Design a binder for these strands. Structure first.
Ligand SMILES: [Mg+2]
Ligand SMILES: [Mg+2]
Ligand SMILES: [Mg+2]
Ligand SMILES: [Mg+2]
Ligand SMILES: [Mg+2]
Ligand SMILES: [Mg+2]
Ligand SMILES: [Mg+2]
Ligand SMILES: [Mg+2]
Ligand SMILES: [Mg+2]
Ligand SMILES: [Mg+2]
Ligand SMILES: [Mg+2]
Ligand SMILES: [Mg+2]
Ligand SMILES: [Mg+2]
Ligand SMILES: [Mg+2]
Ligand SMILES: [Mg+2]
Ligand SMILES: [Mg+2]
Ligand SMILES: [Mg+2]
Lengths: 84, 127, 115, 206, 100, 153, 98
RNA sequence: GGCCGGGAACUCAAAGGAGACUGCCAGUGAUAAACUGGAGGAAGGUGGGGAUGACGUCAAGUCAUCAUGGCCCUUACGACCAGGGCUACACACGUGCUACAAUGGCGCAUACAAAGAGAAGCGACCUCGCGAGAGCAAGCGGACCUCAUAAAGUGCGUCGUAGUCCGGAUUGGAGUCUGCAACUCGACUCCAUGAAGUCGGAAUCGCUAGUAAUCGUGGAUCAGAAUGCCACGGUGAAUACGU
């Protein structure tokens, strides 16, 4: 994990997008490629569409996902079993 | 006055000074029993003096560096055998008959490309 | 003889015997015994009942046994409900910490399943 | 099987290095690249002056280049005119004050680089390969070589199937470390592709 | 290597040279044992804004003659193949085949 | 080998008793070049053996060896698809080598706790024809006797 | 005192350089000690020789860095300048300490 | 405390030399080549190890190191970017690492190496942290400073043959560092967890001596990222009748 003395990481552009989204009141799904940004408390209730490699998947943020990374909720690999 | 001898074995080199005395052995400012605790190593060191029947007739001041326990003990016998023949040339034949005059030239074989060790080869499989 | 709701071996040294408690490894065992004034090479059999109550109070400061099991289960279950990659790896019984699965992974996958 | 490079294996025994400078790790790669650029420019700009060897020395914050040529006149030029331009470009490439020296190669038929270059130039002019090879071997043996081997490989005479052909006269004892073997190569860029040329010239033992 | 790949290398080196001082400043602050939590956090954010290619960890060592991104040797600035070719021609000073 | 340039390597006698045979025994017991460990095991076992037998270290060792040394063994020889176990004499150095190897192998499969105790027990048992080393000697002798007819091969 | 350190990849060359340096300090009447032959550095490089695969096919090379130390003990007022004019051979690295 | 004055002996450093030639002796042998043994010698018969790879063979490998004939694309088969993938996982194989313990595990104490690297680097001492580390900050472009206490070993204690005080996989929590950035997908630390495994079917591999086995150490690549590779010493066997 990122060192605590550095604080959590989040991309500046997504941080501004979220700040605007909380300000306008908006709930239009937020499009982002920042799988690496930490989910912050003010993200709760917003829908963030996180890129997984080919498509943005809607992630409705709850309290429990705070501290995680956005990419933890957009699986990149498609697997349905062998001999299926 | 002192009679000198240089002994070498593996990566070890020993400086042996002998003089008429009552059987003191000191290696690197420590007693023979303190420096070596392996019984094989004190015996090797003792091998030359207990062959020219002078266990207590010559004093022994020794320094040694390099290699480990067996290397340093062999370096010392070799260096005592060289000190004994400085004292008296007549016992050279008896020292050489025991194999003490030879410098054991066996050394660690280098590691080689494509081998795990000097000779150990990676496991082979036909298919 | 009985601590934290389980029986601990009477024939063993105290440090070893205390590790029978779910949640007490060697380090916690030494800490518990140091804080209860009890030596480490003391067999559990040759301990006064008062010393055993001291050990019980020391163990009480740590989360152990069923409480620890509930905590661990709650953490896994939270991960699994969350649907995160870690939780999905828990769901499928596959390695969770990024290990290779092309080969090995047999502790998570279990015995080989022939086609 | 594959053979060791005849020059490299002799590099401290009977053959000298072509670059002689000291450097620490900080400047070593830089000096290697600067030498490469200098040699590439001098090889391109003197392609018609039969240059066999470019020796580079870096005494102290400068570069000293010795050009080994069989035709020193075309390199020195009209009263130093040509070597002046070469020196200017070399000092510009190396970024340090440059000095260019000329060493004359007498008997160009006896040095491997020029022999290989002549063979490749002949091949690019569609000279029959056997003829160029045999003439190179004969000239070297007549001029006093103790031995010469010439090897040519590729689509010889435009054949679809590439092959290797070689001729030898005298002694070419490649396993003898003290043997003074002058070795060099050259490539011919024909309309059918690349033909490689290899020349070994034995000039006596020590 | 492709011409564009060597070009990417050149671009990365130039950008890292350009921004070395600014990045160094921003890091002894995100890092500092005594810096505002906003001043340290404002450095975390100005750091992402500087172009990615100004980070020296984006540079890949390449053979200076071919651009090969594998088998590099820092001492010679060349890949193994070009190192061997130059070594056999006596072009690397002091370097010769070794036995021991 | 095909050429035959192969000759004894010089063996240093053991420090305590000056026995080359005992030094070979230590070498046979040694694993991973850990000679001092093997020496400690051998000396402990010999001391226990002398206390149990009252003879001496070297004499008790010799008495154990004499009951395990084989005199005849079989060497396979293929003839017509069938292999002929041909009984051959065992030369003295190989008798000692086989006896020490069998004793060490027997002591390693024993159930006692330390290897020194297992080795002392094996040497005691062999001193009176009881251990699995003596059993292996008996099996080798009986296999050689069963093939006494095939002594020209 | 003056401490002259010399590095080279060839000993014949260094053994010639270190030696001029000494005279230039023994014509100005200045005392010197050594050359001290300091340990040689052997830098080794192991490379693959196929352009492709054949991991067991390798060349091993080495650059030997020879090192000599010559000390100037009490130097006349021409020592340095002379010293700083001998003009040693290319390929020798000369570092003069004071 | 080579610590100081000193000393140049010794270790060692590294330049130049000497030294091994079947040279000497005996025997065998075709008045040969040679072989068997002996002396002296540090070394004996190619002393040990390396480098060194004939003519060719397999249309063997490499057009993706590079180069290059021909062919093909050219507002795309070229170029730029962010995110993903190369890390997938019913499964089969190769090469390894760690084990299954008592010739061992753990604890305390305490010996003896070689080789190597270092300036956007190696980073001491001191302080803080259980620790990975952090802060401050010497010295060193090095036989000087740093990486950097070798480990096996030895002494003492304990465990007492148990799936264990063996093993250390997996997983939960808490962290460190590098790096714009560790979700996919880093290494490392701490607390907890404690899987399979009790020596491996048919089969099959390496090794003839400072070798095997075993034990640590270093380097390249490299911001970070070895159980791989390359290199270094320590301890140190067994056996070879024979074809
Ligand atoms: Mg991984
Ligand atoms: Mg190109
Ligand atoms: Mg990189
Ligand atoms: Mg002889
Ligand atoms: Mg040869
Ligand atoms: Mg083919
Ligand atoms: Mg291809
Ligand atoms: Mg891959
Ligand atoms: Mg354990
Ligand atoms: Mg490194
Ligand atoms: Mg160095
Ligand atoms: Mg089981
Ligand atoms: Mg068991
Ligand atoms: Mg062999
Ligand atoms: Mg290892
Ligand atoms: Mg690294
Ligand atoms: Mg080793």
């Amino acid at each position: 994990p990122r060192s605590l003395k550095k604080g959590p990481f989040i991309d500046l552009h997504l941080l501004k997008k979220v700040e605007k989204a909380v300000e306008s009141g908006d709930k239009k799904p937020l499009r982002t490629w920042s799988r690496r940004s930490t989910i912050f408390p003010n993200m709760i209730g917003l829908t963030i569409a996180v890129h997984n490699g080919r498509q943005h998947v809607p992630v409705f943020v709850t309290d429990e996902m705070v501290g995680h990374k956005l990419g933890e909720f957009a699986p990149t690999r498609t697997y349905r079993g062998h001999a299926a | 006055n002192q009679y000198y001898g240089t002994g070498r074995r593996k990566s070890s080199a020993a400086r042996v000074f002998i003089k008429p005395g009552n059987g003191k052995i000191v290696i690197n400012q420590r007693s023979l029993e303190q420096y070596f605790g392996r019984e094989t190593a004190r015996m090797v060191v003792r091998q030359p003096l207990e062959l020219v029947d002078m266990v207590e007739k010559l004093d022994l001041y020794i320094t040694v560096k390099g290699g480990g326990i067996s290397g340093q003990a062999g370096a010392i016998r070799h260096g005592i055998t060289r000190a004994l023949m400085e004292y008296d040339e007549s016992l050279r034949s008896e020292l050489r008959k025991a194999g003490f005059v030879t410098r054991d030239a066996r050394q660690v074989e280098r590691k080689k490309v494509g081998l795990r060790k000097a000779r150990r080869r990676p496991q082979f499989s036909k298919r | 003889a009985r601590i934290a709701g389980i029986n601990i071996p009477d024939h063993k040294h105290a440090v070893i015997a205390l590790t029978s408690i779910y949640g007490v490894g060697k380090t916690r065992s030494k800490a518990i015994l140091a804080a209860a004034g009890i030596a480490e090479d003391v067999k559990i059999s040759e301990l006064s009942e008062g010393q055993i109550d001291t050990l019980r109070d020391e163990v009480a400061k740590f989360v152990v046994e069923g409480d620890l099991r509930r905590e661990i289960s709650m953490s896994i279950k939270r991960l699994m409900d969350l649907g995160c990659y870690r939780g999905l790896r828990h769901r499928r019984g596959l390695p969770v910490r990024g290990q290779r699965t092309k080969t090995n992974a047999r502790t998570r996958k279990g015995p080989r399943k022939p086609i | 099987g594959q053979k060791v490079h005849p020059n490299g294996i002799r590099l401290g025994i009977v053959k000298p290095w072509n670059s002689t400078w000291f450097a620490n790790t900080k400047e070593f790669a830089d000096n290697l690249d600067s030498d490469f650029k200098v040699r590439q420019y001098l090889t391109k700009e003197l392609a018609k002056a039969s240059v066999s060897r470019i020796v580079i020395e870096r005494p102290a914050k400068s570069i000293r280049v010795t050009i080994h040529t069989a035709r020193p006149g075309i390199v020195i030029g009209k009263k130093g005119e040509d070597v002046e331009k070469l020196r200017k470009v070399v000092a510009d490439i190396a970024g340090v004050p440059a000095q260019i020296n000329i060493a004359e190669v007498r008997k160009p038929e006896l040095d491997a680089k020029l022999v290989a270059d002549s063979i490749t130039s002949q091949l690019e002019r569609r000279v029959m390969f056997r003829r160029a090879m045999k003439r190179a071997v004969q000239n070297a043996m007549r001029l006093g070589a103790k031995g010469i081997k010439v090897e040519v490989s590729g689509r010889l005479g435009g054949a679809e199937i590439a092959r290797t052909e070689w001729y030898r006269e005298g002694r070419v004892p490649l396993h003898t470390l003290r043997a003074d073997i002058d070795y060099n190569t050259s490539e011919a860029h024909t309309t059918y592709g690349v033909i490689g040329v290899k020349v070994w010239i034995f000039k006596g033992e020590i | 290597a492709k011409q564009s790949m060597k070009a990417r290398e050149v671009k990365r080196v130039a950008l890292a040279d350009k921004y070395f001082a600014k990045r160094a400043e921003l890091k002894a602050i995100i890092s500092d044992v005594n810096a505002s939590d906003e001043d340290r956090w404002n450095a975390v954010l100005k750091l992402q804004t500087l172009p990615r290619d100004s980070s020296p960890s984006r540079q890949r060592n390449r053979c200076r003659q071919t651009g090969r991104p594998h088998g590099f040797l820092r001492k010679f600035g060349l890949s193994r193949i070009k190192v061997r070719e130059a070594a056999m021609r006596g072009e690397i000073p002091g370097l010769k085949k070794a036995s021991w | 080998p095909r050429r035959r340039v192969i000759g004894q390597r010089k063996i240093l006698p053991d420090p305590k008793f000056g026995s080359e045979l005992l030094a070979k025994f230590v070498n046979i017991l040694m694993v991973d070049g850990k000679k001092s460990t093997a020496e400690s095991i051998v000396y402990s076992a010999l001391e226990t053996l002398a206390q149990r037998s009252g003879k001496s270290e070297l004499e008790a060792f010799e008495v154990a060896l004499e009951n395990v040394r084989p005199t005849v063994e079989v060497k396979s020889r293929r003839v017509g698809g069938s292999t002929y176990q041909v009984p051959v004499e065992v030369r003295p150095v190989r008798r000692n080598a086989l006896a020490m190897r069998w004793i060490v192998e027997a002591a390693r499969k024993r159930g006692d706790k330390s290897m020194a105790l297992r080795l002392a027990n094996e040497l005691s048992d062999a001193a009176e024809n009881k251990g699995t080393a003596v059993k292996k000697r008996e099996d080798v002798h009986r296999m050689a006797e069963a093939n006494k007819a095939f002594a020209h091969y | 005192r003056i401490r002259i350190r010399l590095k080279a990849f060839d000993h014949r060359l260094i053994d010639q350089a270190t030696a001029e340096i000494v005279e230039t300090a023994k014509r100005t009447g200045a005392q010197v000690r050594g050359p001290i032959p300091l340990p040689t550095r052997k830098e080794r490089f192991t490379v693959l020789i196929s352009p492709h695969v054949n991991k067991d096919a390798r060349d091993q090379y080495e650059i030997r860095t020879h090192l000599r130390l010559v000390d100037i003990v009490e130097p006349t007022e021409k020592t340095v300048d002379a010293l700083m004019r001998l003009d040693l051979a290319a390929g020798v690295d000369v570092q003069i300490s004071l």
